[PDB]
């Protein structure tokens, strides 16, 4: 479904956790992960956020989170006070080089000044892929996939260009084939499970994780909400835990159109 205001509470909080987290796991900070994968730094582009009234509407705390998000990454981000085309042409007017913007199906980043325009799906699949896939202490190229909509599929997309060998799974057969045929992953079979120590996740659901692939000390890196794997779970495998509602797919998204 869609964020809530609930999600987004203390966005700051939640972006130093996970930008922690991603540093234990990788060695790199979030930044240094954008750097990998598109060569990009921030040189205090300025960047204005328009909201949309859109569907089901302003979605508290959304703006205000792109708004510390971007400041934190380093950007000269502003909110402008009208909305929709009136907050687009008032972002232009101030001098905004990056737009960013969503209404309920799309989310996008458009850099004024080169032309580049990301998507937050495919931005975000293909980030939390890597971040997954550069866990130091892996020992395997084997990484699970489990979701492959328009989050995953990209995901797995960049995993097997990056040479990994990925086993892929949804619970949705006809998302399963078109994986399988497009991309030439692996399709994983629940019942016949193998431990995995690098997983991704991208579904709108609970537990979609099984105990029997997970090994101990695995990165389990996931955009979806909720949380795939309950506490007690993660707990007894001492699961690393890569997961945050926006502000990752967010710098994923602006370094990709720098
Ligand atoms: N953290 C972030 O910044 C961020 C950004 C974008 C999207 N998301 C979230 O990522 C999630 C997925 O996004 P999407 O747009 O790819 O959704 P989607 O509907 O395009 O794809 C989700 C897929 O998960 C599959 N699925 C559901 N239950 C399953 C199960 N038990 N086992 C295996 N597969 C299962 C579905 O069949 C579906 O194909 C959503 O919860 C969305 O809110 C998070
Ligand atoms: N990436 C796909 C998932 C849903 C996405 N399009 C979204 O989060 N919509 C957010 C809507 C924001 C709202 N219009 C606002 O400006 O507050
Ligand atoms: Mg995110
Ligand atoms: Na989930």
């Known amino acids: 479904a869609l964020l809530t205001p609930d999600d987004l509470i203390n966005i700051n909080m939640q972006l130093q956790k996970a930008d922690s987290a991603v540093q234990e796991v990788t060695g790199l900070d979030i930044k240094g992960i954008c750097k990998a994968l598109y060569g990009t730094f921030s040189s205090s582009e ?3 956020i328009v909201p949309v009234t859109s569907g089901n509407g302003i979605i508290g705390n959304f703006s205000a989170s792109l708004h510390a998000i971007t400041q934190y ?12 085309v009136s907050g687009y042409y008032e ?7 990056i737009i960013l913007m969503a209404d309920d199906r799309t989310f996008l980043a458009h850099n004024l000044k080169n032309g580049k325009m ?11 892929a890597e971040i997954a896939s550069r866990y130091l202490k892996a020992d395997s190229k084997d990484v699970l996939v489990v979701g492959l909509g328009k989050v995953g599929f990209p995901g797995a997309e960049h995993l097997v260009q990056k040479d990994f060998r990925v086993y892929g799974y949804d619970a949705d057969e006809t998302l399963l084939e078109r994986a399988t045929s497009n991309l030439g992953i692996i399709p994983f079979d629940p019942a016949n499970p193998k431990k995995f120590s690098i997983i991704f996740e991208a579904t709108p659901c609970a537990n979609t994780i099984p105990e029997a692939v997970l090994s101990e000390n695995c ?3 996931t955009p979806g909400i909720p949380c795939a794997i309950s506490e007690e779970l ?3 495998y001492e699961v690393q835990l890569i997961a945050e509602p926006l502000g990752i797919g967010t710098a994923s998204m602006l370094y990709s159109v720098l």
Do not use: H, W
Request: hydrophobic share 35%; glycine share 10%; aromatic share 10%.
């Open 46 to 48: 300025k960047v204005g």
């Open 234 to 236: 993660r707990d007894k």
């Open 91 to 97: 972002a232009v007017q101030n001098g905004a080089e």
């Open 118 to 128: 990301a998507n937050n799906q495919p931005c975000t699949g293909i980030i939390y």
């Open 73 to 84: 990454f380093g950007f000269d981000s502003f909110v402008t006070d009208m909305p929709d």
């Open 219 to 221: 990165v389990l890196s």
